[PDB]
Amino acid sequence: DLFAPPPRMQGKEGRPKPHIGPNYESYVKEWAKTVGPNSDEWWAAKARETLDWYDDFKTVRAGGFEHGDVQWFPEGTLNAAYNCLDRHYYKNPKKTAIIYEADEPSESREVSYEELMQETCRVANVLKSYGVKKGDAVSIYLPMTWQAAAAFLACARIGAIHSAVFAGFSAESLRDRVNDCECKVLITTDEGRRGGKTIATKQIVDAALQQCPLVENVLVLRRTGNKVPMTEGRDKWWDEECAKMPAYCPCERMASEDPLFILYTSGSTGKPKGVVHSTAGYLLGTALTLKYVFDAHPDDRFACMADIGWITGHSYIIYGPLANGITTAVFESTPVYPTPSRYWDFVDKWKATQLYTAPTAIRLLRRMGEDHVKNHDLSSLRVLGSVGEPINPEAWHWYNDFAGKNQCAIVDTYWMTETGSISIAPLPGAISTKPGSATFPFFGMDVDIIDPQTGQVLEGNDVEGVLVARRPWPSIARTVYRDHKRYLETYMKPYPGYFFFGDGAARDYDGYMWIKGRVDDVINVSGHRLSTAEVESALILHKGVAETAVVGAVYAFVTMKPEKEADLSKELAIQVRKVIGPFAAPKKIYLVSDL
Amino acid sequence: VHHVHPLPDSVPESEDLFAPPPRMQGKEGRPKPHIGPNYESYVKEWAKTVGPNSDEWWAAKARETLDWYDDFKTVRAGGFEHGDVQWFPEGTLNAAYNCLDRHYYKNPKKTAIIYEADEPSESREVSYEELMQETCRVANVLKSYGVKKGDAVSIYLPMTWQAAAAFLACARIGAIHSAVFAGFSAESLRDRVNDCECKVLITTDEGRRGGKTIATKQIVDAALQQCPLVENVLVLRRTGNKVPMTEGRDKWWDEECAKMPAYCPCERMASEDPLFILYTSTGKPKGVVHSTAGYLLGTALTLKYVFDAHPDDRFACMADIGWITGHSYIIYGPLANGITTAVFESTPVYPTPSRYWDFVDKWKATQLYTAPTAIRLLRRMGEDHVKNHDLSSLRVLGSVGEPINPEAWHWYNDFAGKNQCAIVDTYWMTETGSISIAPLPGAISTKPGSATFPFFGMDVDIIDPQTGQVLEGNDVEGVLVARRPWPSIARTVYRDHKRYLETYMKPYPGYFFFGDGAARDYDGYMWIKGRVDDVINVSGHRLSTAEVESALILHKGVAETAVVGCADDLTGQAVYAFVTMKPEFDLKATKEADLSKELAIQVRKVIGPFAAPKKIYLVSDLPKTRSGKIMRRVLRKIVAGEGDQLGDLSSIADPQIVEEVKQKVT
Amino acid sequence: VHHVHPLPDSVPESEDLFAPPPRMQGKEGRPKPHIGPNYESYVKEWAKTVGPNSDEWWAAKARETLDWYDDFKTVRAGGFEHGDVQWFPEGTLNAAYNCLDRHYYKNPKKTAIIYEADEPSESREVSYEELMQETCRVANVLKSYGVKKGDAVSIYLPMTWQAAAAFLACARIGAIHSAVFAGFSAESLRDRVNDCECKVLITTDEGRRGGKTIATKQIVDAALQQCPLVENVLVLRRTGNKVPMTEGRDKWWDEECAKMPAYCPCERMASEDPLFILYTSKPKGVVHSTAGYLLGTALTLKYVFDAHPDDRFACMADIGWITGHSYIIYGPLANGITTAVFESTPVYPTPSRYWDFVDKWKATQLYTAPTAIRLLRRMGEDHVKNHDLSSLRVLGSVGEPINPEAWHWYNDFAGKNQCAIVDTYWMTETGSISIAPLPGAISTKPGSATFPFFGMDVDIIDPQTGQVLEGNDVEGVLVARRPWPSIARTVYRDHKRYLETYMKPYPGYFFFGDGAARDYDGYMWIKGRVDDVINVSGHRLSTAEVESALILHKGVAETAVVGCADDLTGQAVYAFVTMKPEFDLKATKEADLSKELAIQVRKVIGPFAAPKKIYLVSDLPKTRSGKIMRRVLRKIVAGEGDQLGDLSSIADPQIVEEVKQKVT
């Protein structure tokens, strides 16, 4: 039940030879350079080789967990849009930056680096005309159309701080995130299209903004052109604003530690935290993980099927793939629209070389039956990635058997919003995989197991407890927006000297890491990171509810105040979908007399 | 023999080619030319500046010519189609550092500006030190008003030397200056102030020009009644005469500057950060935007090479800083090169028509640059005003703004140059940033009325407007286009990029469209013969304005003319001529009717029967812009009976002349 | 046959020259001096720093001493006449990076600040790491208030260590700090807050100094009723006693910094961006820029105090004074050494306090004002004689002439005759020390600043002719020939006042406003303010010479002399004299003491200098900087107490009422 790198990962059959290979010892030889007291050399070289800098840095790293003053390359300056767009445009303008796989397959097209750069510059000029300055927050409420990348990168280009809100969030959820970050500008769309259905985004925006007193300008992408309300003065059409502007905009020269984005994320306690990532270390971590975990080569076509509203979309749709100058997929549809062949129809149409998805999507397709995958080529694929949650053994094999035809590496990538980039994963040209194991830590990641009853490291193999990291890494989140106390309390205080992931883990006799799962009240349902406390708070607000308990699929047990039962389950399911979002409805709601 | 003909000239073609004269051969102690001595030396250098291997030359010139804070990596990118032209994008620099600080550090007492005041006795030299100190003071004042990098600042200043300090103070802090000709109407000023959305305006109490007062502050007050965004007005006390001053909003330049230090740091600007907006006038005011490095490099290189400027030169561009010619060849080009530049406050005829030449001999100017309208005006006034001057300090005489008739070219050559100067006919536009086609004076043998050959970085073609296709070879005529971007091309029209693309990039896709008709003759010389909109199509013969206007001025007594087309049942269009005669010409001994017949006969001889004017109107003057362009569109619309659709003419050189034309046409 | 005489001393001139002692010779385990061992070694180096070939030295020192983000091209430009002085203009840097980040990266646990709290038990060491984290948190707070590069921020903080974090947080983001002595009146604070047009003010709930509370927040509340531009106040919870807090406007420093990360990027500042405004007494906002000022404070700290990497530098002044700007915060921290922040007074809880501090922390240099030295001398030797103090190598004096009698007390009891004494002359407007001994090189004379610092070329001008007096044995007014890197660049929004005060009196020169003499050995003697000169029967008298003569009498603690108009001699000397506490006014009646004091002046200087009238007073009116306010005394003697102005913020306003009573 151990899977050595298959021929597609040995440079055989004309494929690109792996960056790291061919065995475990070859991974350790490199990894040892990236951790410990003599690792600055490797990190300084990779930083200078991977990114284009305006000013060089002097100091590789400083700071630490205790006070949350982590620093990487502090004196250097750079721009994330320059590194993701301009520098590749200058070398090969007509290269496809984005494969835009529209909700309807026949509406898909390739977007060149030139076209993406031009649209990013126009949007940036629009934002500057609204008075957006370096360090201002800008909220983004966009579905999976390719212009979402232009939106993110236009903010990065001028040094604004984008805060992307998942297009599956409700009006109240959008409003809360818009208000927390105090942005004065919101970028959205008239409607979204997903799985053949319409998302009334502008309608949701108008309801949210009724209680957002700081928002002054809304830029509206005309994705469908159907009639939506537009407030005079406040609301402008993306195409009409961009048509006034030049198709080039200079890049703001950003410090390595200037904030790049806020991304609101659920914790075990309290409301969603605005997780803040800075610029150089985050960009470096995503570029290096993309190159090494997926063994990306210059002509690859990388298909991350995630959503830009989540950290997986930030790191492995936009920043990672574009920093590397390759082609990245922006997938607007679902895995089963029009049919469950879609993922494989897509792979064959574009000859995708890697595919990155959640264990849930894989399990759903396995439910729909092997008819939809057994008769495709898929030989373009070399690596199949999984992220967001444990992948079951049956899913791992099905992924390897059908999607991979037993010639692909399966990289099980463990990480979190707060880690910025992948933390534990097999390198696919070197590591033999066990189904369900993340295997070995990535470069810069020194992880350990701690007994929670003790607070001390369990050294050796065949141990189990809580996962922690010994030392900062370049892409670690730097703060929680305007709430640093919560950052320290959650991640740095439980085990002083270490970073606390919040997951359980075990290291078997071979040193393979096995991610047990959250030891707190965070649950992963279909790859999404949901707090049981937020679901209870959503349910508690329903008129008549007296006490709720939500436990990890999500299941809620509710008791009503003394003032049909299946019809009540639906009204509470709608209450959760209204407070959080449709994706957050519990799998079952049980009405009991006492908890 | 040839399809393309030179502009009509009384001199035979075989006697009409002018080699670089001894002052431009390094003789008589003059500087050796940077490019010389012949056409082959021009081609050898120019070939380095165009085509797929020309990055090397442009990168070297960029690094040699300007002082940078950060080097660039990329030489050029982008293009016409979407209007994303980029040059040296990763570099950073500052225009004020390059025009002031670096020269002040080497020679603080060198004269930066010869300030020739309206009254000659008030003129004086302004050192680089003084100019830099005043620039820094104004920059500190602007910062105190909260002006930040990228904010627009309007400038409504007449031709006193502090106008350069106001431009360069904006550049020093990265504000975008938008300069409006002093004397423009309140309405024309308002439209430009509102369009650029500036919050600060810089002006004078009054200007003085030709012994007349320009009521700048009163005009400003009228304009700002309809400009709600302007919060601060800085008022230079040019005359000290009583003007209204609004409490809070308005402050005296001297009182504000006296509070500030005389040094200010330079903002580090990206190459592509906007340097200025410059409004030109057939629709709404068009705010032409130039960025920083490519514009500065183009003005510096053209000033050096087209005028063959050397370190001790005293360069006399006689234009106004409200015109692109003053932006590029008064302020940015000469000061970037560290030489001495003239700021001329007066007119070519105040106190007398000897003014230009009194000025040349007083200051020993080494080059003079003006417009054909000024040249035709001085020619009209007679030779006594020039013949008894020295003028030998001059080596190059330049002409800009419209075609120069060979008759006017010979006058310039004979009297201003005494047949010992090179004449550079410099063709370009606000949108090109710097000179596009011109003789290099140490290399090119000139033909009267020809711009001759494209400048470094300019690769131009002729398109047949009837087919949309490029005409190959020599002896072809059509419309002028450029094949590739050049460093100083305008980057956009302010907040109206669609107008930029539709005006310049859409008419001939793949090319830049100038809007001028042009010909490339059998020797490869370029002739720019008038605006495309001004062409007159008589029975299929397409006549350029320059050729017919050049024929008419061959007649004794003619001072200046303009020809326009009017619809005609038999010939499609017919030529109509507006003719100004010298003041002494006796219009009783030659009635209006016999003059017209002599003029028509002369046009037929040198051009052809089809070009003879159907009707001729004698007028005391022609409608012109402040810069000297003849407003043929106005004349064409009046002949068409559309005198009520003319537009905003409140700010032309003399709006009263429009009523005279309307009366003479009726 | 010398026309210039040393300040009156009881020691014969032949026994009054002090070579660098063993602790400044590299003996006794102490570091070798950077410049030594004699005068020749000083002048050899100094010659590289002035004149037409000095660019090379200055460019090298600038690049060696500071960390730059962008190198400069031009070393210097501009000048006095128009006030356009420039140094290193194209370079970019950040003062907080140079005072914190770069040392934190080298040794984060090295002590940056010895915080000597008002109560000794509360003193502690603050690491570079801790100081940098605090600074960054405050910078992030200021950024959240919309503070941009080039905005002014007022600071009204007492001598707690966080005042350094507040200064450097402003520098980190490129804001311009304006610090105001804690305890200045609401009116004085208001005038300075209004003049700099700041929108943010940083203060404490209260200050603690000498066992007394300073009601900083109460004063701030009164000032801000007349400061319409201030929108945010950040309040450091120093004492925890209840103080009013205005909703919206006022926020607690700890509560604000707890929201923010403990790192903030540095704004990349041009060399000539303003670093700070510092008001002196209309209030004059002296402006310093960034690179030249920082370089000047770093070089003077290193060379005048012979600072080495492990030194523990104890400047006992207040950050409200330029001395605290340059020699508590910027100079010592730019050099990466340890610096003292002293919250107390020299006599709390007892006058042993300085020496308790020196022995507790093993201070290697001590820097204070002559007023403090004479105060400790007044309290007698029991408080100092039985301390160790051997960790000290250099004792500095700044702010006014140091009388030779007090110099010797400093030398004998604080230094135990084993320290170099550096009498450092400079001004708020010079940024850093202008004339001082280099302690490993110069043999000192009591009361003499000795020789100009690197980059300072000073001359003496005869004020009657406007002409430079060349050579030695000359006296007149002190001027500087050429700009130096740390010169003030303007007076805030009043450049005309800057030019008229400093640059127009003697065109081509900088006018200090002090009288000076250069003796036969070339030693400079700063003898008092030009405005304080007294002219008796054609004899021009400086304050320092007459006050130095008076303090030679037993039991005198401190004096001040001023002129009184006289019909027959033009002016007459009037003197105000404070005596030691144990001096018996019953054994020596006041009338007899005053006669003795006048006889002593007549013998040492001459009859024209002998006071015509002597007033014994309990103390003298002094600024918070320690300056004796002779103008106030002069106006009272002249019957002009109505024109005194607002003195609500001098050290003790009650003393003016005593003086008025005695002169009446």
Ligand SMILES: CCOP(=O)(O)OC[C@H]1O[C@@H](n2cnc3c(N)ncnc32)[C@H](O)[C@@H]1O
């Ligand atoms: C990347 C999205 O990050 P987030 O939305 O912040 O969720 C992060 C949380 O998902 C879980 N998780 C992610 N990858 C894996 C994996 N390979 N195996 C097991 N569990 C995983 C885990 O509990 C983590 O703590």
Ligand SMILES: CCOP(=O)(O)OC[C@H]1O[C@@H](n2cnc3c(N)ncnc32)[C@H](O)[C@@H]1O
């Ligand atoms: C530089 C002033 O730029 P503008 O005020 O924008 O005018 C630009 C317009 O003037 C015309 N023009 C300028 N110079 C010449 C010339 N040497 N020969 C012929 N025509 C010329 C032409 O019609 C152009 O398109």
Ligand SMILES: CCOP(=O)(O)OC[C@H]1O[C@@H](n2cnc3c(N)ncnc32)[C@H](O)[C@@H]1O
């Ligand atoms: C550094 C404090 O600067 P300020 O508070 O601006 O005082 C500056 C004014 O103090 C005086 N002064 C300072 N040090 C000395 C000294 N060592 N010897 C003599 N006089 C001195 C002098 O009158 C100067 O002009």
